[PDB]
């Protein structure tokens, strides 16, 4: 069984490179962040442009939704993160503390906390309600490329250009694990929906499925191009069990999680596919491309 | 304008 992802909608509006696309947990919306300093909201099923959210002084590298789908958090080159009330478009808080580009961000499941990663080499844990930085983790010795909470928010996984993936205890801020045959820059990391595995991408055209407890590599996925960009990868769980990733050859790659075989390549983009997202309940992939393309694509499969 | 949109040189 292979998926049958076909193009349904192309979403144009950003005037500079799109950096990140994320589906709201309620499945109604898609949020996009761009180098044009804007956040855009789009209908998840019809690609219908909804609204623009502005405020950042420089471009945005990442965006994430709260669990109730009411708030967004964005990570900007302006060295801040901003918390937004989606319906009103208001900026609730400006998160200050990072001394360089804020690259990545995520809410925890309870959505009372925000995790962020920066070029300043740190991981920061923020209180949503107050906007205060609760902890600064001396995480890495190079830019932090990704940050993600596990299923119950008790763990944080971070990745960096230093070649490491680190597992952190949310409550204490203590480093619980360091994942090390070589150390190529780690451009992306995230926990599996069950929280037992971590999917990590490295700038050597390789994606790896790790078992965090045992520190063992279970699966390796290749065939795509990834040597310069921090491309988002995902676990597609609505139909068949796939690994979805963007690629520097302008394609969306889909692998069978178990066999590691490429099951689909999506053609359509005209620049690096920097970001992909999988809909929480429907077999829908959102993809986003860089400066020379500027569009977002919505693809759907029967399985 | 955005760090993620720039390649690792």
Short mmCIF file of C-alpha atoms in Angstrom, two decimals:
data_model
loop_
_atom_site.label_atom_id
_atom_site.label_comp_id
_atom_site.label_asym_id
_atom_site.label_seq_id
_atom_site.Cartn_x
_atom_site.Cartn_y
_atom_site.Cartn_z
CA UNK A 1 0.00 0.00 0.00
CA UNK A 2 1.31 3.40 -1.24
CA UNK A 3 -0.47 6.78 -0.73
CA UNK A 4 -2.08 8.68 -3.61
CA UNK A 5 -1.29 12.37 -2.66
CA UNK A 6 -2.43 14.76 -5.38
CA UNK A 7 -2.38 18.58 -5.47
CA UNK A 8 -5.65 20.20 -4.48
CA UNK A 9 -4.75 23.81 -3.70
CA UNK A 10 -1.82 26.23 -4.11
CA UNK A 11 -1.77 29.04 -1.54
CA UNK A 12 -0.22 32.32 -2.73
CA UNK A 13 0.11 35.48 -0.63
CA UNK A 14 3.53 35.66 1.08
CA UNK A 15 5.91 38.05 -0.76
CA UNK A 16 9.10 36.34 0.61
CA UNK A 17 10.16 32.69 1.42
CA UNK A 18 7.68 30.70 3.51
CA UNK A 19 9.49 29.26 6.56
CA UNK A 20 6.94 27.01 8.32
CA UNK A 21 3.39 25.60 7.92
CA UNK A 22 1.34 23.98 10.79
CA UNK A 23 -2.26 22.61 10.95
CA UNK A 24 -4.31 23.71 13.97
CA UNK A 25 -4.96 20.73 16.38
CA UNK A 26 -8.76 21.12 15.69
CA UNK A 27 -7.96 20.49 11.95
CA UNK A 28 -9.77 23.68 10.76
CA UNK A 29 -6.78 25.89 9.93
CA UNK A 30 -3.31 26.13 8.50
CA UNK A 31 -0.90 28.80 9.84
CA UNK A 32 2.11 29.92 7.79
CA UNK A 33 5.12 31.99 8.82
CA UNK A 34 7.41 33.78 6.33
CA UNK A 35 10.61 35.85 5.79
CA UNK A 36 8.10 38.71 4.90
CA UNK A 37 7.57 39.09 8.75
CA UNK A 38 3.99 37.88 8.48
CA UNK A 39 1.86 35.07 9.77
CA UNK A 40 -0.99 33.98 7.44
CA UNK A 41 -4.05 31.89 8.32
CA UNK A 42 -5.72 29.59 5.72
CA UNK A 43 -8.64 27.11 5.69
CA UNK A 44 -7.17 23.57 6.03
CA UNK A 45 -9.61 21.88 3.63
CA UNK A 46 -10.29 24.58 0.96
CA UNK A 47 -7.00 26.56 1.06
CA UNK A 48 -9.12 29.74 1.44
CA UNK A 49 -7.02 32.70 2.72
CA UNK A 50 -8.34 33.75 6.14
CA UNK A 51 -6.19 36.60 7.61
CA UNK A 52 -2.73 38.15 8.12
CA UNK A 53 -1.18 38.55 11.58
CA UNK A 54 1.65 41.17 11.84
CA UNK A 55 3.97 42.60 14.48
CA UNK A 56 7.43 41.03 14.15
CA UNK A 57 10.18 43.51 13.17
CA UNK A 58 12.07 40.87 11.14
CA UNK A 59 11.24 37.58 9.36
CA UNK A 60 9.79 34.53 11.15
CA UNK A 61 11.41 31.04 11.03
CA UNK A 62 8.69 29.13 12.90
CA UNK A 63 5.09 29.15 14.13
CA UNK A 64 3.17 26.70 16.44
CA UNK A 65 -0.44 26.35 17.72
CA UNK A 66 -1.72 25.97 21.27
CA UNK A 67 -3.63 22.64 21.97
CA UNK A 68 -7.06 24.39 21.99
CA UNK A 69 -6.14 26.02 18.52
CA UNK A 70 -6.78 29.59 19.95
CA UNK A 71 -3.19 30.82 20.17
CA UNK A 72 -0.08 30.87 18.04
CA UNK A 73 3.56 31.32 19.01
CA UNK A 74 6.03 32.62 16.38
CA UNK A 75 9.91 32.56 16.41
CA UNK A 76 11.63 35.55 14.70
CA UNK A 77 15.03 36.92 13.61
CA UNK A 78 14.00 40.02 15.68
CA UNK A 79 15.27 37.90 18.73
CA UNK A 80 11.77 37.55 20.18
CA UNK A 81 8.83 35.19 20.21
CA UNK A 82 5.26 36.53 20.12
CA UNK A 83 2.07 34.96 21.50
CA UNK A 84 -1.00 35.69 19.42
CA UNK A 85 -4.72 35.39 20.04
CA UNK A 86 -5.78 34.02 16.58
CA UNK A 87 -9.45 35.28 16.41
CA UNK A 88 -8.59 38.88 17.35
CA UNK A 89 -5.08 38.95 15.77
CA UNK A 90 -3.80 40.59 19.02
CA UNK A 91 -0.24 40.12 20.22
CA UNK A 92 -0.75 38.84 23.84
CA UNK A 93 2.96 38.71 24.80
CA UNK A 94 6.39 39.46 23.37
CA UNK A 95 8.92 36.88 24.73
CA UNK A 96 12.33 38.57 25.21
CA UNK A 97 15.57 36.99 26.37
CA UNK A 98 17.29 35.40 23.38
CA UNK A 99 20.38 37.28 22.22
CA UNK A 100 20.17 36.04 18.59
CA UNK A 101 17.61 34.78 16.03
CA UNK A 102 14.84 32.69 17.56
CA UNK A 103 14.66 29.72 15.17
CA UNK A 104 12.12 27.22 16.50
CA UNK A 105 9.22 27.05 18.97
CA UNK A 106 6.48 24.79 20.36
CA UNK A 107 3.74 24.78 23.03
CA UNK A 108 3.59 21.85 25.44
CA UNK A 109 0.32 19.72 25.39
CA UNK A 110 -1.18 21.57 28.44
CA UNK A 111 -0.18 24.79 26.49
CA UNK A 112 0.84 26.60 29.71
CA UNK A 113 4.50 26.46 28.46
CA UNK A 114 6.40 27.43 25.31
CA UNK A 115 9.77 25.97 24.32
CA UNK A 116 12.06 27.93 21.94
CA UNK A 117 15.44 27.36 20.29
CA UNK A 118 17.84 30.04 19.05
CA UNK A 119 21.11 30.85 17.18
CA UNK A 120 22.31 32.03 20.66
CA UNK A 121 22.74 28.21 21.36
CA UNK A 122 20.20 28.10 24.16
CA UNK A 123 16.77 26.49 24.71
CA UNK A 124 14.33 28.64 26.70
CA UNK A 125 11.18 27.56 28.57
CA UNK A 126 8.52 30.28 28.84
CA UNK A 127 5.35 30.77 30.87
CA UNK A 128 2.46 31.45 28.39
CA UNK A 129 0.28 33.45 30.86
CA UNK A 130 3.03 35.82 32.13
CA UNK A 131 5.42 35.88 29.14
CA UNK A 132 8.32 35.28 31.55
CA UNK A 133 11.30 33.02 30.79
CA UNK A 134 11.10 30.22 33.40
CA UNK A 135 14.43 28.49 32.43
CA UNK A 136 17.38 28.99 30.10
CA UNK A 137 18.99 25.63 29.26
CA UNK A 138 22.73 25.81 28.20
CA UNK A 139 21.61 23.28 25.57
CA UNK A 140 24.17 23.33 22.81
CA UNK A 141 27.43 24.80 21.44
CA UNK A 142 25.85 25.86 18.08
CA UNK A 143 22.45 27.15 16.78
CA UNK A 144 19.41 25.17 18.00
CA UNK A 145 17.57 23.92 14.94
CA UNK A 146 14.46 22.35 16.62
CA UNK A 147 12.61 21.96 19.95
CA UNK A 148 9.62 19.70 20.67
CA UNK A 149 7.73 18.49 23.78
CA UNK A 150 6.72 14.83 24.13
CA UNK A 151 3.06 13.55 24.55
CA UNK A 152 2.69 14.52 28.25
CA UNK A 153 5.06 17.55 28.09
CA UNK A 154 7.49 15.99 30.67
CA UNK A 155 10.31 15.96 28.07
CA UNK A 156 11.84 18.36 25.56
CA UNK A 157 13.89 17.17 22.60
CA UNK A 158 16.38 19.69 21.04
CA UNK A 159 18.69 19.50 18.00
CA UNK A 160 21.66 21.64 16.93
CA UNK A 161 24.34 22.30 14.29
CA UNK A 162 26.71 20.87 17.02
CA UNK A 163 25.60 17.39 15.83
CA UNK A 164 23.63 16.52 19.00
CA UNK A 165 20.04 15.70 19.98
CA UNK A 166 19.35 16.23 23.67
CA UNK A 167 16.45 15.10 25.87
CA UNK A 168 15.57 17.49 28.73
CA UNK A 169 13.37 17.09 31.81
CA UNK A 170 10.74 19.90 31.48
CA UNK A 171 10.38 20.35 35.27
CA UNK A 172 14.09 20.45 36.35
CA UNK A 173 15.77 21.61 33.15
CA UNK A 174 18.23 18.70 33.48
CA UNK A 175 19.79 17.03 30.43
CA UNK A 176 18.54 13.45 30.52
CA UNK A 177 20.17 12.09 27.29
CA UNK A 178 22.66 13.05 24.54
CA UNK A 179 22.28 11.16 21.20
CA UNK A 180 25.58 10.49 19.41
CA UNK A 181 28.68 6.98 14.36
CA UNK A 182 29.49 10.66 13.49
CA UNK A 183 28.14 14.16 14.41
CA UNK A 184 26.89 15.96 11.18
CA UNK A 185 24.80 19.14 11.97
CA UNK A 186 21.30 18.16 13.23
CA UNK A 187 18.79 20.29 11.29
CA UNK A 188 15.51 18.92 12.75
CA UNK A 189 14.15 16.70 15.55
CA UNK A 190 10.74 15.66 16.95
CA UNK A 191 9.16 12.96 19.06
CA UNK A 192 6.88 10.32 17.55
CA UNK A 193 3.14 10.64 18.47
CA UNK A 194 3.56 7.88 21.16
CA UNK A 195 6.72 9.59 22.52
CA UNK A 196 8.90 6.43 22.34
CA UNK A 197 10.97 7.49 19.29
CA UNK A 198 12.64 10.65 17.90
CA UNK A 199 12.85 11.48 14.17
CA UNK A 200 16.10 13.43 13.46
CA UNK A 201 17.38 14.95 10.22
CA UNK A 202 21.05 15.66 9.54
CA UNK A 203 22.76 17.77 6.86
CA UNK A 204 24.09 14.63 5.14
CA UNK A 205 20.73 13.87 3.27
CA UNK A 206 19.61 11.48 6.03
CA UNK A 207 16.58 11.14 8.33
CA UNK A 208 16.83 8.78 11.29
CA UNK A 209 14.34 7.13 13.63
CA UNK A 210 15.82 6.77 17.09
CA UNK A 211 14.75 4.95 20.18
CA UNK A 212 15.44 7.53 22.85
CA UNK A 213 15.76 5.29 25.89
CA UNK A 214 18.20 2.82 24.39
CA UNK A 215 19.99 5.39 22.29
CA UNK A 216 19.60 3.15 19.22
CA UNK A 217 18.96 4.02 15.54
CA UNK A 218 16.01 1.94 14.36
CA UNK A 219 15.39 3.29 10.87
CA UNK A 220 17.28 5.39 8.28
CA UNK A 221 15.47 7.22 5.38
CA UNK A 222 17.35 8.60 2.32
CA UNK A 223 16.85 9.45 -1.39
CA UNK A 224 16.07 13.17 -0.72
CA UNK A 225 18.42 16.22 -0.69
CA UNK A 226 19.15 17.94 2.67
CA UNK A 227 22.55 19.63 3.20
CA UNK A 228 21.84 23.34 3.80
CA UNK A 229 18.35 23.84 5.26
CA UNK A 230 16.45 23.00 8.45
CA UNK A 231 13.61 21.10 6.79
CA UNK A 232 10.65 19.92 8.88
CA UNK A 233 9.87 16.19 8.87
CA UNK A 234 6.68 14.42 10.12
CA UNK A 235 5.03 11.12 11.07
CA UNK A 236 1.85 10.70 8.93
CA UNK A 237 -0.58 8.58 11.05
CA UNK A 238 -4.10 9.27 9.60
CA UNK A 239 -3.84 6.53 6.94
CA UNK A 240 -0.74 4.47 6.23
CA UNK A 241 2.32 4.96 8.49
CA UNK A 242 4.68 7.29 6.59
CA UNK A 243 7.57 9.69 7.12
CA UNK A 244 7.03 12.97 5.28
CA UNK A 245 9.78 15.51 4.54
CA UNK A 246 10.58 18.43 2.29
CA UNK A 247 13.78 18.38 0.19
CA UNK A 248 16.32 20.72 -1.50
CA UNK A 249 15.38 19.15 -4.90
CA UNK A 250 11.90 20.96 -4.59
CA UNK A 251 9.99 17.71 -3.83
CA UNK A 252 7.90 16.37 -0.93
CA UNK A 253 9.19 12.84 -0.06
CA UNK A 254 7.03 10.14 1.55
CA UNK A 255 8.59 6.89 2.94
CA UNK A 256 6.90 3.78 4.35
CA UNK A 257 7.97 4.16 8.03
CA UNK A 258 8.73 0.37 8.39
CA UNK A 259 10.38 -0.66 5.06
CA UNK A 260 12.19 2.75 4.61
CA UNK A 261 11.26 2.72 0.87
CA UNK A 262 10.19 5.93 -0.90
CA UNK A 263 6.42 5.48 -1.57
CA UNK A 264 5.79 8.95 -3.16
CA UNK A 265 7.55 12.08 -4.46
CA UNK A 266 5.42 15.23 -4.91
CA UNK A 267 6.25 17.55 -7.81
CA UNK A 268 4.96 21.12 -7.96
CA UNK A 269 7.24 23.44 -6.00
CA UNK A 270 9.89 25.57 -7.75
CA UNK A 271 12.23 26.12 -4.75
CA UNK A 272 13.42 24.16 -1.66
CA UNK A 273 10.53 22.53 0.21
CA UNK A 274 11.43 23.82 3.67
CA UNK A 275 8.32 22.66 5.49
CA UNK A 276 5.69 19.98 5.50
CA UNK A 277 2.85 19.31 7.94
CA UNK A 278 0.34 16.43 8.24
CA UNK A 279 -3.37 17.10 9.04
CA UNK A 280 -4.39 15.66 12.49
CA UNK A 281 -7.46 13.66 11.18
CA UNK A 282 -7.50 13.72 7.32
CA UNK A 283 -4.90 12.39 4.84
CA UNK A 284 -3.77 15.95 3.91
CA UNK A 285 -0.16 17.24 3.63
CA UNK A 286 0.65 20.98 3.57
CA UNK A 287 3.99 21.90 1.96
CA UNK A 288 5.84 25.31 1.82
CA UNK A 289 8.74 26.57 -0.32
CA UNK A 290 11.56 29.14 -0.28
CA UNK A 291 12.23 32.61 -1.82
CA UNK A 292 11.93 31.63 -5.52
CA UNK A 293 8.56 29.92 -5.05
CA UNK A 294 6.77 31.60 -2.02
CA UNK A 295 3.71 29.26 -2.23
CA UNK A 296 2.10 26.69 0.06
CA UNK A 297 0.56 23.48 -1.38
CA UNK A 298 -2.25 21.28 -0.02
CA UNK A 299 -2.20 17.63 -1.12
CA UNK A 300 -4.73 14.90 -0.32
CA UNK A 301 -4.76 11.05 -0.57
CA UNK A 302 -7.52 8.36 -0.18
CA UNK A 303 -5.18 6.50 2.28
CA UNK B 1 14.78 38.17 6.48
CA UNK B 2 14.34 34.77 8.15
CA UNK B 3 17.24 32.52 9.35
CA UNK B 4 15.51 29.29 8.27
CA UNK B 5 15.14 30.62 4.67
CA UNK B 6 18.98 31.09 4.45
CA UNK B 7 21.32 28.11 3.70
CA UNK B 8 24.00 26.88 6.11
CA UNK B 9 27.13 28.36 4.46
#
